[PDB]
């Protein structure tokens, strides 16, 4: 592992960040002082959920809660393939992270994000309560249930 960390090959270190993510070694990746890994995540954060989650962990441990709430909220409003329940977790985290002070950011900007995440989380829970009840309902034909699961187990719908 010395030979690994003693390298200056950049495509290599990118390939190793991806490999650590694959194997699940949050142990060793979260323990890198470097910003090089943060910058690498900032480009692909809004591309994949698993990468965004890593980026948000780096922000939170650095008391940058508002920036994580921003990543999580945009990810919940996006058209990436994300389940409704995963979008409930993202909003719930963003709601908490925007409710606490982050230095350098105005109280107004925090509250406006904590409010957008609170409303979207309220709608998401309604949608989850619906989807669950509809799937379990004995009086609903199977043919329709599959159709319900397609349109409700994804991005959050209007009221």
């Amino acid at each position: 592992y010395n030979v690994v960390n003693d390298s200056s090959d950049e495509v290599f270190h990118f390939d190793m960040y991806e490999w650590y993510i694959e194997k699940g070694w949050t142990d060793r990746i979260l323990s890198i002082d470097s910003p090089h890994v943060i910058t690498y995540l900032q480009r692909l954060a809004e591309t994949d959920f698993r990468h965004a989650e890593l980026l948000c962990r780096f922000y939170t441990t650095r008391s940058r809660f508002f920036e994580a709430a921003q990543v999580q909220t945009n990810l919940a409003k996006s058209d990436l393939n994300i389940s409704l329940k995963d979008r409930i977790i993202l909003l719930s985290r963003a709601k908490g992270n925007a409710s606490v002070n982050t230095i350098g950011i105005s109280r107004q900007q925090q509250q406006q994000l904590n409010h957008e995440a609170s409303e979207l989380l309220e709608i998401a829970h309604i949608q989850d309560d619906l989807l669950e009840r509809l799937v379990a309902d004995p009086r609903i034909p199977e043919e329709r249930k599959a159709e319900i699961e397609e349109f409700l187990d994804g991005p959050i719908r209007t009221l």
């Binding site: 609903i140 329709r144 009221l159």
Partner: peptide
């Protein structure tokens, strides 16, 4: 923003196509 429209929906109790 909510807008009720009972007019044209999709029969929740009938399959598609």
């Amino acid at each position: 923003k909510l807008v009720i429209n009972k007019d044209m929906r999709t029969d929740l109790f009938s399959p598609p196509n």
